[PDB]
Symmetry: D2
Amino acid sequence: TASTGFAELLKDRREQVKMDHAALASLLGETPETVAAWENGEGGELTLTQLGRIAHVLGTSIGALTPPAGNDLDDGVIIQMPDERPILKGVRDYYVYNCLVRTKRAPSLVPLVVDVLTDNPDDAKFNSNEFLFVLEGEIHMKWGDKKEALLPTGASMFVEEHVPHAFTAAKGTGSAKLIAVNF
Amino acid sequence: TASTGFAELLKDRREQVKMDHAALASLLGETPETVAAWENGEGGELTLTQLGRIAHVLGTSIGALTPPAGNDLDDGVIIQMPDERPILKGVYYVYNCLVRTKRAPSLVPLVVDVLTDNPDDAKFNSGNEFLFVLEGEIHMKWGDKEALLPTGASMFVEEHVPHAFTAAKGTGSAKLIAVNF
Amino acid sequence: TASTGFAELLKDRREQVKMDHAALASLLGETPETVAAWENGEGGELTLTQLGRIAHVLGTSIGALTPPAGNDLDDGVIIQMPDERPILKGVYYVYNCLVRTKRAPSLVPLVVDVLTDNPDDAKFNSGNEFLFVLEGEIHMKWGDKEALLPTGASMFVEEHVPHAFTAAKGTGSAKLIAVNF
Amino acid sequence: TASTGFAELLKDRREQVKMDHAALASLLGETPETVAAWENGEGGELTLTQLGRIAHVLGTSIGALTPPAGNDLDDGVIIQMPDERPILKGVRDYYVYNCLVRTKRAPSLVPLVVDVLTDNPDDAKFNSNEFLFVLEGEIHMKWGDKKEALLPTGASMFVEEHVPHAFTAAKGTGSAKLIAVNF
């Protein structure tokens, strides 16, 4: 939880720097009562700005004083039925992003089924780790300076971070689909 | 800046999970305009609880949406003169805090004044820690082991290890330089 | 290069711990010339045991003294055509390995052919793993829990979690795309 | 241990990539017997070059197939008496490095007592995280483009990684000493 995580992390950092409620309260310009309260799990109303100041006085970051994402698994597993997929369209029309399962235990995991609706290579716009798999059709991949390659169904690829790239269905083939797993 | 840093990282994350303003807004019970306000540096009054909810909806943590500690160095250096040391009591023990930096938050160095020379009254307490015997003779205890450490002796203590120091029996007091990192 | 990488990192570490050739040599029972040979790219014949001793004397690990996996990317990209997939048997299970890279060693993706449609004969096995039901209906088990997953369903399984799949009872077989990272 | 660590890490990576002794042996051009042996703790004689090839085939690094530094603590502690300090002189004469305690459980920890024998600032040569404390005398610190500051006994400082810097005793004071803790 947020307030409880903050309460346990605040106390930890406080002592880590040899301060007692009195000492931190003084640097902060608050009462030992207040600091004691926060550490009792009563800081949920503290604002971003107030938190930044606390983080500054303790010489660390807000992230260091806040709990991790949390657990949303059921005995280590999380499942998503195709009916629950949130959808985002890249209108210009061009791409449809069908978001697959995600988890707070691995925040960087952003998997998707990307429908590639355009089959005009020249109409590809560079975006800028990721694993991909051609689900259906033929994909025309372009990367680097805004190289390319034509990939058949079943081909897989890895694109390193910061690598600008664009996807389009093979010219004339109409459309294509791919699984993109960002991680 | 906290508010500034959040605006940028919030935009990055929301975009990362393929969420438009409306979607995020819908899940939070807010307006798409309010989200755009946040991503514009106007999230300063957001409460810890709210940030947590925003983080939860974006499947990540508050730390992921907040900026790093910051930079308080002068071309890579930060210096502390002996007069600036904050002094904290261990009422027993006196902690004279040495230089610290937001670029290495875990660095907590100190000159510890060890005021008691009676091991029998030693009290155990307590990441990694490096120690150096600055003055006197230190009686050290740990485990649940002991050792007499003369001036100039150095030691390393791993995280979670209970230990205690006192000046050698009848020596009055001693000083340690402790570097927690 | 392994030999090249080692030469450089060996020099860096030895210097880091304030050791001259002679000192290192003394502790290893070698000559100062032999060490200079190593730091010159001539450590190719050193045995695993020896590297470990060198590492030990330098108070670090063999990994600290050896180069990273390397770079097999083409301007950040690596591609695998369906014909290049190595195929491995799970004799039951067929593992068609997809693209891998030395720049992300933990990435082990596959298309798994699930050949049995009898949950009773399911066998449990097994970092993080993302899965997608490519074809058919998958019967999944884990914990010590079950679930019927239709085509297009996606799942995430955390490290150390025992689980097993089989095609739905009487469906013959199914296919999964599994991404271990 | 090295051979045993390698045996447990090799097997781990092997299976991690779905291979059996036969499969890896084939890619490697060796017998399942040999690979089985290595995994039985019999690979201590493998050379650096041979290891690199194994690491290459398994698509990872030698470090990923080798055990961590190891444990050299006594119930979490390691002590060094001033008599055991290894010494290195920076002759040009100029500096004496009295190495303090080190540990395989924190390899980056390199503490030292540095005797600054020169008191001619102009004779300071830039070296290029670290915490420092002036033990004795006055130190003249220079950093950045090959800024400066005069630090009295008891002052402490933090120097970030890659920051080129040079130390010298205050001009005319003769010599000085400092504790330098690299980490």
